Design a protein around this ligand. Structure first.
Ligand SMILES: COC(=O)[C@H](Cc1ccccc1)NC(=O)[C@H](CC(=O)O)NCCCc1ccc(OC)c(O)c1
Lengths: 514, 514
């Protein structure tokens, strides 16, 4: 079968092949939730194929694990649903029973490591259990900052930069183009609330102002829209249309945005800059709504593209199946081909990290490995210590368990003759700087940079007066005669001229006349 | 004593229980390197008192012929040590197979049977959610004597959770009722930067908007001082006389230590249960100078016989013959002098009620005739859960009722710190049960004249007045007068329009004249 490959040591693989934001978490008639009826997602199957390709390479390459077969067992975890049972299935002692003990130092679990879930909530839920056994867990796409507390999650490591760096990239991009007045949309779930709070803090500290924050309804493309949801979407898009802000930052699952963008199309809306968060920045499905060309320009945050060799051709016990996955991926294969492996590198590096850590744990030379029983805590102990080059990049684990990889800002392109996600800038998390911004193309008449700002910059001799709550909004008022704006000291008030000098209106100088 | 040995006894049906019997030492916050549970040697009295309350409740349920006639009810208590790592091990142990020490990973459970019927849940909210995922996946009843966290109301994610204490929303709606009934439509809100306070601020902000209460300022204070200085500075800048402080005890102590450092200005503080009842904050000197402190506390009956019960059992627990009848260390060394301070603790009732509710729910599920239950195969947890959603049960008197939300209908008393000497006397000045009854003449304010202190804003103005918004949600206006020599051309607009050189008008005028 596709989801299982025997070996001497086994890796547990968790990916979300099917998803539904309103899925049932509890048992149905005392049978474990079955995900086949939820919507299939192409990119999750792509990442699962990435794991399988990585293990194929490791089994072929005798230089890394000579004579040791590396196997895997993969289970579908469907957003929240089916969180619990796969963990017990990984931990059980080969007859699906897990004994309760006061000590697990000598307990041989069925898998030695878990390539963990893609969702923050699933990651935390699984880590709660795997923390007891100290079974090493590596997650490739869960960005929430909560995961940095290793007293809280000792067993957990990541191969993608934390949410802080995503927010930093967005903020520095907005600063570079000197935007000042932005809209924020969130999807009424914990991902949206997390990232919205973090963005609020950073933006407030950096002098940009969030003009507007709003929550989307949790609509679904297969489901018919109710009148109330329609009214809500109408309200949201009307609010945006009548407002002056045109930078729109969207934190949402891709499933939620289909109806939102359709409604935006109904409203004849145009002219925005859509800052797409990682959760949808590279979705093939949304990209194929070719009418989006008229809604402005789309810039997304993602992890740096690294071209994996050979993986392009490779892409050509309940809840271990997917029927529609291959039929779905077959259609998008061309678009996927053009899009350089991005998150695929996170999965690839996770598997290679476990491979190297196991290779070191066995003390293995590149001739033979002295096979022995491996207990997960020792493999975690060795995983913390690896440092090696992988495909012209390099991975080693920080004190917080993260790995440093370049972030990338990408513009959506619709020509279909070349890469649909063009690189336009790159953010280095070690330097905490956005770097090497290239030629973005704009919807504007002559590619002059668009902007949205609360108030235009005042003329010389005009002091500020705050308009309201936001520091970013100010009226301009000329200084009165006999007073001047000492711009080197203050911006909000005009100072009086010396007792022997005077000034005109809207003047910074003083002169010796009555 | 021989008292740890009493934390278990047999029965035809078994109740599991989680309490903070022990705690970690500060040096005991060890970084684990082998997978074994932290050994929480350090004792804590509150947990033991709650466990004794559970023992008393089960003893009564066995004694009464009116409930579960012909069956013996047993219990099995475990320490949580207030951490997920420790709490999760007995959580797994509870759901192990009947008559065995193993947990099973089957894909269907139609005739599976765990060793416990239901679990008396943990006290703190973090443990409540962590164990709620697990227990609600299996559809096992969980009944918590604490965990006011509002997030637990969600039946999409916590189907089987119940509690015998009101959730945060009841207290916050009572606070909104207080503000509305006293007429304080202009306030500031502060919370502790933990999930408790950070969720409370969201709930209260939405409620305040719904009832027309305007929030001048929002902020969070850290738990263990730049942000504290910033928060109090902004509060003073906001020109507000009423401040809500929905903060954990340590955060409140930090903020009021800063206030002790300098009492910048006095204000009416709306407290929360935790601060309102915790000694280390109540002991701070001269707090009458802060302004009056108000807050709502829920009222339930005492366990009148409980102190005599504890006296009796701590006397009995050392008889050399009775000892013939170590999950908690140091439990066996305790003496009544270290326990006495907590014998009157209000939360014991919530433990007692919980047990009774479960017992009642079982009695209904078995359909027991009062003279004896009918013969049946063992009741499974998911059978009991179906009956428990619509359950009315007496607790000594005062019959309570669960509903679909899993909460109980319970009423609140408005407590005022009437300061006398260095001691605040807790004075009742009203009740809330969904509507607020206030005995206003009894409260004496901090302001010398003992008239009601004023914290309000306008939302209406003669049309000749400006409309510049203020407040965190722009829910207030300034009403500044339109200038003489100008006319108010636009209703509800900001500006006014000026008149000719020979053209004159009053202030607030809509017209000008020759
Ligand atoms: C609660 O957060 C969310 O619901 C969202 C969206 C989501 C919903 C259902 C299933 C997966 C994702 N999460 C994220 O975007 C997480 C960040 C985090 O979750 O911390 N980064 C994933 C980037 C690569 C990715 C992998 C799998 C994909 O589909 C199977 C997919 O679309 C994108």
């Amino acid at each position: 079968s596709d989801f299982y490959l025997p070996g001497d040591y086994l890796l547990g693989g968790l990916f979300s092949l099917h998803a539904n934001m309103k899925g049932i978490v509890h048992l149905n008639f005392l049978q474990v939730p079955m995900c086949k009826e939820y919507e299939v997602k192409v990119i999750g199957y792509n990442l699962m194929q990435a794991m399988r390709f990585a293990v194929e390479e490791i089994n072929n390459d005798s230089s890394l694990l000579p004579g040791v077969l590396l196997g895997y067992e993969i289970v579908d975890v469907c957003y929240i649903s089916n969180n619990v049972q796969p963990v017990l299935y990984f931990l059980a002692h080969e007859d699906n029973l897990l004994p309760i003990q006061e000590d697990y130092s000598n307990y041989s679990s069925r898998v030695v490591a878990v390539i963990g879930p893609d969702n923050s909530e699933s990651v935390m839920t699984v880590a709660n259990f795997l923390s007891l056994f100290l079974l090493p867990q590596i997650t490739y796409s869960a960005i929430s900052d909560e995961l940095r507390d290793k007293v809280r999650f000792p067993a957990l490591l990541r191969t993608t930069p934390s949410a802080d760096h995503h927010i930093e990239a967005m903020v520095q991009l907005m600063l570079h183009f000197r935007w000042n007045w932005i809209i924020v949309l969130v999807s009424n779930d914990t991902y949206g609330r997390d990232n919205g709070q973090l963005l609020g803090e950073r933006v407030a500290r950096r002098g940009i102002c969030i003009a507007f924050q709003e929550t989307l309804p949790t609509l679904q493309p297969n489901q018919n829209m109710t009148s109330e949801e329609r009214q809500r979407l109408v309200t949201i898009v009307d609010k945006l249309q009548q407002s002056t802000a045109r930078v729109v930052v969207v934190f949402s699952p891709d499933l939620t945005l289909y109806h939102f963008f359709n409604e935006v199309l109904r409203q004849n809306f145009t002219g925005a800059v859509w800052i797409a968060s990682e959760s949808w920045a590279i979705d093939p499905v949304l990209h194929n709504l070719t009418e989006l060309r008229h809604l402005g320009t789309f810039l997304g945050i993602t992890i740096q593209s690294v071209p994996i060799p050979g993986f392009s051709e490779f892409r050509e016990t309940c809840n271990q199946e997917c029927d529609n996955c291959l039929n779905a991926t077959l259609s998008f294969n061309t678009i996927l081909r053009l899009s350089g492996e991005r998150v695929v590198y996170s999965v690839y590096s996770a598997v290679y990290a476990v491979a190297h850590a196991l290779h070191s744990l066995l003390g293995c030379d590149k001739s033979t490995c002295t096979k022995r029983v491996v207990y997960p805590w020792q493999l975690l102990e060795e995983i913390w210590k690896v440092n090696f080059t992988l495909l012209d990049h390099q991975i080693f684990f920080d004190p917080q368990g993260d790995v440093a990889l370049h972030l990338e800002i990408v513009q959506w392109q619709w020509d279909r003759s070349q890469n649909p996600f063009q690189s336009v800038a790159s953010y280095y998390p070690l330097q905490r700087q956005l770097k090497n911004i290239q030629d973005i193309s704009w919807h504007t008449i002559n590619n002059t940079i668009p902007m949205s700002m609360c108030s235009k910059r005042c003329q010389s001799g005009q002091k500020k007066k705050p308009v309201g709550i936001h520091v970013c909004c100010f009226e301009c008022i000329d200084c009165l005669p006999g007073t001047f704006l000492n711009h080197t000291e203050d911006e909000y008030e005009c100072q009086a001229c010396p007792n022997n000098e005077w000034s005109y209106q809207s003047e910074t100088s003083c002169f010796k006349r009555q | 004593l021989c008292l740890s040995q009493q934390l278990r006894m047999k029965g035809d049906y078994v109740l599991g229980g989680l309490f903070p019997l022990g705690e970690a030492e500060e040096a005991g916050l060890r970084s684990r390197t082998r997978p074994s549970s932290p050994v929480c040697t350090r004792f804590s009295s509150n947990g033991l008192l709650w466990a004794l309350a559970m023992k008393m409740a089960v003893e009564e349920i066995n004694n009464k012929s009116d409930l579960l006639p012909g069956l013996r009810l047993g219990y099995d208590l475990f320490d949580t040590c207030s951490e997920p790592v420790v709490a999760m091990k007995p959580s797994l142990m509870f759901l192990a197979k009947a008559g065995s020490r193993d947990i099973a990973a089957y894909c269907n459970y139609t005739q599976y049977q765990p060793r416990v019927l239901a679990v008396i849940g943990p006290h703190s909210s973090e443990l409540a959610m962590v164990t709620g995922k697990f227990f609600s996946f299996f559809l096992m009843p969980q009944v918590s004597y604490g965990a006011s966290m509002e997030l637990l109301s969600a039946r999409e994610t916590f189907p089987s959770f119940f509690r015998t204490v009101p959730s945060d929303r009841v207290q916050l709606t009572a606070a909104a009722e207080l503000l509305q009934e006293f007429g304080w439509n202009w306030v500031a809100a502060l919370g502790s930067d933990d999930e408790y306070g950070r969720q409370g601020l969201s709930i209260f902000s939405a409620l305040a908007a719904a009832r027309g209460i305007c929030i001048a300022h929002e902020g969070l204070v850290p738990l263990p001082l730049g942000k504290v200085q910033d928060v109090l500075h902004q509060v003073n800048q906001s020109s507000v006389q009423v401040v809500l402080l929905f903060a954990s005890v340590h955060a409140a102590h930090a903020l009021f230590n800063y206030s002790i450092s300098s009492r910048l200005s006095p204000k009416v503080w709306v407290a929360s249960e935790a601060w309102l009842t915790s000694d280390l904050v109540m002991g701070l000197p001269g707090m009458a100078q802060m302004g009056t402190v108000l807050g709502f506390l829920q009222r339930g009956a005492q366990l009148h016989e409980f102190p005599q019960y504890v006296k009796t059992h701590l006397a009995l627990a050392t008889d050399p013959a009775f000892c013939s009848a170590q999950r908690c260390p140091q439990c066996d060394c305790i003496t009544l002098q270290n326990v006495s301070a907590g014998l009157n603790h209000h939360q014991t009732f919530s433990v007692y009620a919980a047990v009774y509710s479960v017992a009642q729910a079982l009695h209904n599920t078995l359909q027991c005739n009062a003279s004896g239950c009918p013969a049946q195969d063992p009741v499974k947890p998911w059978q009991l859960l179906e009956n428990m959603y619509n359950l009315t049960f007496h607790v000594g008197g005062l019959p309570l009722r669960f509903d679909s939300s899993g909460n109980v209908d319970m009423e609140y008393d408005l407590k005022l710190w009437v300061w006398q000497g260095s001691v605040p006397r807790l004075h009742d000045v009203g009740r809330f049960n969904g509507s607020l009854r206030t005995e206003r003449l009894k409260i004496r304010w901090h302001t010398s004249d003992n008239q009601k202190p004023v914290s309000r804003c306008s939302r209406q103005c003669q049309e000749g007045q400006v409309r510049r918004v203020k407040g965190f949600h722009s829910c207030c206006y300034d009403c500044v007068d339109c200038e003489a020599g100008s006319y108010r051309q636009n209703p509800d607009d900001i500006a006014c329009t000026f008149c000719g050189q020979d053209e004159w008008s009053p202030e607030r005028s809509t017209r000008c004249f020759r």
